[PDB]
Curated annotation (Swiss-Prot):
Protein source organism: Bacillus subtilis (strain 168)
A family per Pfam: SpoIIE
Gene giving rise to this polypeptide: rsbX
EC number: 3.1.3.3
First-tier enzyme category under EC: hydrolase
UniProt keyword annotations, A-Z: Hydrolase, Protein phosphatase
Protein name (Swiss-Prot/TrEMBL): Phosphoserine phosphatase RsbX
Biological role: Negative regulator of sigma-B activity. Dephosphorylates RsbS. Plays a role both in maintaining low sigma-B activity during growth and in reestablishing prestress sigma-B activity after induction. Could have a negative feedback role by indirectly communicating sigma-B protein levels.
Length: 199
């Protein structure tokens, strides 16, 4: 499944495909942009299939509902919703277009890479563990991006040697998605990614 959106400030593409032979995806995403701001999130539920879905889907619902809050507030709501559930790894990104500012908070193995034209990348290491409902000491990143920046957020189902290169070479989110096609054919796990190109 592919979903594309565009406004004056960003173009985005969401890709998701289930693990081969699996009916119920354990990954979830949420994406909304208006003329002023973006929120997006990607999550991978612990366990698999349905119960994994309950955890990642709870994340998607809370990010939509609480989108106006700061990323760390949103992720803590997500953490509290994981008590008595499988848990999930998750990443939450907000962008203010006028300021060209992003804010990012994550726990687990959902990765975020933002490539700058100038050749700077923001590519944080994964935070160990997962959102379980037990206490967390979150790290929030706040930074300015430059016009032309391109990013991806992806679950562990996408395994790529050099993601930065795909972001650098692509001229659009469709092109970057197509550039990644070889990594999508095996379907060894659920695979979700969100691409963005920022004006
Ligand atoms: Mn996974």
């Amino acid at each position: 499944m592919i979903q594309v959106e565009e406004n004056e400030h960003i173009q985005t593409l969401v890709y998701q495909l289930n693990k081969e032979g699996k009916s119920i995806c354990g990954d979830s995403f949420f994406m909304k942009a208006d003329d002023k701001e973006l929120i997006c999130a990607v999550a991978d539920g612990l366990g698999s299939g349905s119960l994994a879905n309950e955890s990642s889907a709870a994340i998607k619902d809370l990010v939509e509902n609480y989108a106006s809050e700061d990323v760390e507030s949103i992720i803590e709501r997500c953490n509290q919703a994981m008590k008595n559930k499988r848990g999930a790894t998750a990443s939450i990104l907000k962008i203010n277009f006028e300021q060209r500012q992003f804010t990012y908070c994550s726990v687990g193995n959902v990765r975020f890479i933002l490539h700058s034209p100038s050749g700077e990348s923001f590519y944080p290491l994964p935070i160990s563990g997962y959102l379980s409902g037990k206490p967390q000491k979150y790290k929030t990143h706040t930074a300015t991006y430059e016009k032309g920046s391109k990013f991806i957020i992806h679950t562990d189902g996408l395994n790529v040697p050099d993601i930065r290169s795909h972001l650098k070479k692509g001229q659009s989110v469709e092109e970057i998605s197509n550039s990644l096609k070889m990594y999508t054919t095996s379907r060894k796990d659920d695979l979700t990614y969100i691409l963005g190109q920022l004006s």
